[PDB]
Design a protein around this ligand. Structure first.
Ligand SMILES: [Zn+2]
Ligand SMILES: [Zn+2]
Ligand SMILES: [Zn+2]
Ligand SMILES: [Zn+2]
Lengths: 144, 23
């Protein structure tokens, strides 16, 4: 399952960079560079809402992800799928990861990343395949 | 309702972001 594995790496790496403030083929690298630019921008422009969403979420710890998975499924339950919703969910994942690290500097981002990746890949498998996976993400968010 | 409120917010932002880049 190359798609699952590729998606978890991109999403995990972003969340870890965001939470820790450190950055460590070329297709995955383009995806991560796109996600940094777009994801950082979502967070910057939606600071107030993300703060409100975080408050409501009331996440207890690094493993407390079932509520977020329910949120993500509910997001798509109107039958619309698009990259803006997808990157927004990942950006909020990053925003949550930063908060977890604040309360406990030893928290791991993996349960969150895995939770988000599971929703996207499992529930939107064929949509992602038709988009040519992360190549579609890169293309959609391509700016000159 | 909290989970629905969060979802409503995330959807609004996601559709706004989608529109911005699609235009
Ligand atoms: Zn870990
Ligand atoms: Zn270009
Ligand atoms: Zn709803
Ligand atoms: Zn926006």
């Amino acid at each position: 399952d190359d798609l699952y594995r590729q998606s978890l790496e991109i999403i995990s790496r972003y969340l870890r960079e965001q939470a820790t403030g450190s950055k460590d083929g070329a297709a995955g690298r383009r995806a991560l560079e796109t996600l940094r630019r777009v994801g950082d921008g979502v967070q910057r422009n939606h600071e107030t809402a993300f703060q409100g969403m975080l408050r409501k979420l009331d996440i207890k710890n690094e493993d407390d992800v079932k509520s977020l998975s329910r949120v993500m499924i509910h997001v798509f339950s109107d039958g619309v799928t698009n990259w803006g919703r997808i990157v927004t969910l990942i950006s909020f994942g990053a925003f949550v990861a930063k908060h977890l690290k604040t309360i406990n500097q030893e928290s791991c981002i993996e349960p969150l990343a895995e939770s988000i990746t599971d929703v996207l890949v499992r529930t939107k498998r064929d949509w992602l395949v038709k988009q040519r996976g992360w190549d579609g993400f890169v293309e959609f968010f391509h700016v000159e | 309702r909290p989970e629905i409120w969060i979802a409503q917010e995330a959807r609004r932002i996601g559709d706004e972001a989608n529109a911005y880049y699609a235009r």
